[PDB]
From a paper:
[name] is a newly recognised member of the CDK protein kinase family that is activated upon binding to the membrane-associated protein cyclin Y (CCNY) or its homologue cyclin Y-like 1 (CCNYL1). The crystal structures of monomeric [name] represent the first structures from the [name] family of CDK kinases. The kinase domain exhibits the classical bilobal architecture intermixed with short insertions that help to define the CDK family fold. The predominantly α-helical C-lobe contains the CDK/MAPK insert, which packs against the αDE and αG helices, as well as a [name] family specific C-terminal extension that stretches behind the αI helix before folding back to terminate beside the αD helix.
In contrast, the rebastinib complex has a canonical αC helix that includes the [name] motif, which probably reflects the additional interactions this region forms with the bound inhibitor. The rebastinib co-structure displays an inactive ‘DFG-out, αC-in’ configuration. In this structure, Asp304, Phe305 and Gly306 are flipped into an inverted conformation relative to an active kinase. The activation segment therefore folds antiparallel to the β1 strand and occludes the front of the ATP pocket. As anticipated, the binding of rebastinib is facilitated by an inverted conformation of the ‘DFG motif’, which creates an extra pocket for inhibitor binding below the αC helix. Rebastinib forms a total of five hydrogen bonds with the ATP-binding pocket of [name], as similarly observed in the equivalent ABL structure. The carboxamide-substituted pyridine ring forms two hydrogen bonds with the backbone amide and carbonyl of the ATP-hinge residue, Leu243. The urea moiety's nitrogens also form two hydrogen bonds with Glu211 from the αC ‘[name]’ motif. The central phenyl ring is sandwiched between the gatekeeper residue Phe240 and the flipped-out Phe305 (DFG motif), providing strong π–π packing interactions.
Numbering used by the authors: 162 to 311, 317 to 474
């Protein structure tokens, strides 16, 4: 019964194309992820899992699956549209976002992640392209998967948000992997530029150590016993302070960033604890007791600041 038109191309993958569209029933803008049923599959397993996942997750800061459409030749997942991703948002402000708004975006990111982590969902591929933001200022987590998006177009960002302990063969694939990426997104919102833009596993680890400093048995118990680190022979860097690099962070902000960017996942501040960090004290007591399904903008003391 509810039908849709395609308006524009948002992203394109191997098996799927994502279109911007519009409901003919409601006039609401949607995203239509159309998956080609080339082989005699029914629906492909990936789509079934994506759908079963997004149906079980109900949170204001996770993208909302609105509808599914099956024809003989395609399966289309219909998501509610949001106006921009974070990178587009940055770009529309000449890479200088209102710091109050940065606080709101970070908070909402942390709210969505905390829910995911409570449902045992590791995101594992956080990056600006996966953070969608609407006119109202609501931020929702996506995973575009493949879908290469339609000047910052087509940048290879594969490793930029990857944590150094995982890049050196840690087997602790916990929700804390995301906490490192949160850190990297925070810096990028705060400065408009990526924190650790490495092309290789070796150079990603390098760039990291150029800011955080080279590890030791103090800063990383058992690090010199690691064979891969032993081989990756880096010069001993002295830690630069994060606050100099990102002056727009207050000392609370920089303190939160440092707690996110711990070499090892065991020691990073969690999403839940990060929401209680003093950095967010300006947003009040009410925001912490909101239902999962309620926008933080329901609070009225939460408002988006005009952007330049
Ligand atoms: C400017 N506006 C726009 O460009 C724009 C574009 C737009 O299009 C889409 C947005 C999101 C999705 N889908 C998802 O995000 N899926 C998802 C979320 C998660 C979470 C819950 C882990 C985050 N896991 N998986 C998810 C889960 C399982 C998967 N299995 C295989 C492959 C992928 C998978 C993804 C989509 F298909 C199209 C919507 C609004 N605005």
């Amino acid at each position: 019964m509810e039908t849709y038109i395609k308006l524009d191309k948002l992203g394109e993958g191997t098996y799927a194309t994502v279109y911007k569209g519009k409901s003919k029933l409601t006039d609401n803008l949607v995203a239509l992820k159309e998956i080609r049923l080339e082989h005699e599959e029914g629906a492909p397993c990936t789509a079934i899992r994506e759908v079963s996942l997004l149906k079980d997750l109900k949170h204001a800061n996770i993208v909302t699956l609105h509808d599914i459409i099956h024809t003989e030749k395609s399966l289309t997942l219909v998501f509610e549209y949001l106006d921009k991703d974070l990178k587009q948002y940055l770009d529309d402000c000449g890479n200088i976002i209102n710091m109050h708004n940065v606080k709101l975006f970070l908070f909402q990111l942390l709210r969505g992640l905390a829910y995911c982590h409570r449902q045992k969902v590791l995101h594992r591929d956080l990056k600006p392209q996966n953070l969608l933001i609407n006119e109202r200022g609501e931020l929702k987590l996506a995973d575009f998967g493949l879908a290469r998006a339609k000047t910052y177009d087509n940048e290879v960002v594969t490793l930029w948000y990857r944590p150094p302990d995982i890049l050196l063969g840690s087997t602790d694939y916990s929700t804390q992997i995301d906490m490192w990426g949160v850190g990297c997104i925070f810096y990028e919102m705060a400065t408009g530029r990526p924190l650790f833009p490495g092309s290789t596993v070796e150079e990603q680890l390098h760039f990291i150590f150029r800011i955080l400093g080279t590890p030791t048995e103090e800063t990383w118990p058992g690090i010199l016993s690691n064979e891969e680190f032993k081989t990756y022979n880096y010069p001993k860097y002295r830690a630069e302070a994060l606050l100099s690099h990102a002056p727009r962070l207050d000392s609370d902000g920089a303190d939160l960033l440092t707690k996110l960017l711990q070499f090892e996942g065991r020691n990073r501040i969690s999403a839940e604890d990060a929401m209680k960090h003093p950095f967010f004290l300006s947003l009040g007591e009410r925001i912490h007791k909101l239902p999962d399904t309620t926008s933080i903008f329901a609070l009225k003391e939460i408002q988006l600041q005009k952007e330049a």
